[PDB]
Every structure is written in structure tokens, then in C-alpha cells.
Amino acid sequence: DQVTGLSDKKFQRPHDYSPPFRFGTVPNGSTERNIRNNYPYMHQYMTKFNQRGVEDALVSLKTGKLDAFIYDAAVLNYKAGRDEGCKLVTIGSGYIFATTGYGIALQKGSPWKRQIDLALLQFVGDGEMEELETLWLTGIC
């Protein structure tokens, strides 16, 4: 394993290591804000490493047009569970990272809020949420 995480020395300067690597994200995306809020210098380095499409970066990683790429965990985990060859490798398990959740955006003060949350907790409280993960997630090895 090469990269420890966001604290890795590679994220200090690509010139610090002999091979000048490259890593970007989706433009106008949510995670781009996290880079700017935490490390504005990282955004300056990511400025020259920008890409256009999610699978375009996936093609670049397979072809070798990109060294590393930063995106969400659940999305990148599924694309790696069905990939042939499995050349691309995930890093960690959400260990040095946000560890947040997925939610439903409601209008402020919606009266549905109490009813919606009761079902969602009950949905994970009876194993029904577990089966849906089996249907749409595939972890080999």
C-alpha cells in the first residue's frame, strides 16, 4: 500500500517525490468544497489535475492518464466490486475522512420530518436495509 491518507507526504508537494503524480476530482462537485475549506493549496495543485467525467477519470486510471483520484466511498466501492482485472485499489475504510451519511433534503420545517425518520430508523431496525445493500452492492474477495 502506498498512500496513508490525506496526511501523506505526497499531498505536500508532487515534486517531493521523483515521479510527478496527478489527482483531481469532479468539477463543480461537493468534495471540491472540502479541499478548498481544508487545504486551499491542494485546490491550487488540483487546478492542473482537473478532469471532466467520472468514468473519464476511471478510464484515465486504467489507461494511465491519471495517478490518483478523489471521490466518494460508496460510489467508488461499487465500481471496484464489478471491475474486471481489479487494477484500481481503494484506500482505507473511511478512517481519516469525513465519515458522514446520505440524507433527504426537505423544505425547512417540513411536518413530514418526524414521520420520515421513524420509518428510516425502522427500515434499518429490521434488516430490510441490509437486503437492499446485497441487491446493489457486490464485494468480492
Binding site: 472540502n34 481544508n38 481519516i96 469525513a98 458522514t100 434499518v124 441490509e130
Partner: protein
């Protein structure tokens, strides 16, 4: 203690707690499966102004690395 004396054979318990315990004592062994993926919350009274800013503070701590420092203090630590 009872399972340490080899009187018990299985015991349902939390994940991180038993991870830290196996870190402290090498004889403590866990299983492989990971089920009931939920979270721990802050027990509160009924609706009160001590709810909004509390959850906002929890989110602001999760977004940055303070939870990482807490892990380094107690959870990440090993033997």
C-alpha cells in the same frame, strides 16, 4: 472475566469496544461478521433549544479532524 476464565463461549457486544479490548489483551478474539450497522447518539430531553446547536456541533466536529484526535487518544490506540 467469565469468558476470560473460559466459562463463557460467546458474547454479543459492540465493535470498537471489543476492538480496543483485543488490542489490550491478545487472548480476546472476535468474530468475522459485521451486523446491525447503526450509530450511537446523545440521549436528550424533549424538544428544547439544547438540540439544534448540539447536533450542529456534532456535525462540525465530524467534518474536521477532531474525531481523529479522539480516536488517537482512545480508539486508535493499540498495544
Amino acid at each position: 472475566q467469565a469468558v476470560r476464565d473460559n466459562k463463557l463461549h460467546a458474547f454479543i457486544w459492540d465493535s470498537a469496544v471489543l476492538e480496543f479490548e483485543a488490542s489490550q489483551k491478545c487472548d480476546l478474539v472476535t468474530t468475522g461478521e459485521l451486523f446491525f450497522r447503526s450509530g450511537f447518539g446523545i440521549g436528550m430531553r424533549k424538544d428544547s433549544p439544547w438540540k439544534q446547536n448540539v447536533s450542529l456541533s456534532i456535525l462540525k466536529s465530524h467534518e474536521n479532524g477532531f474525531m481523529e484526535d479522539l480516536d488517537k487518544t482512545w480508539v486508535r490506540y493499540q498495544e
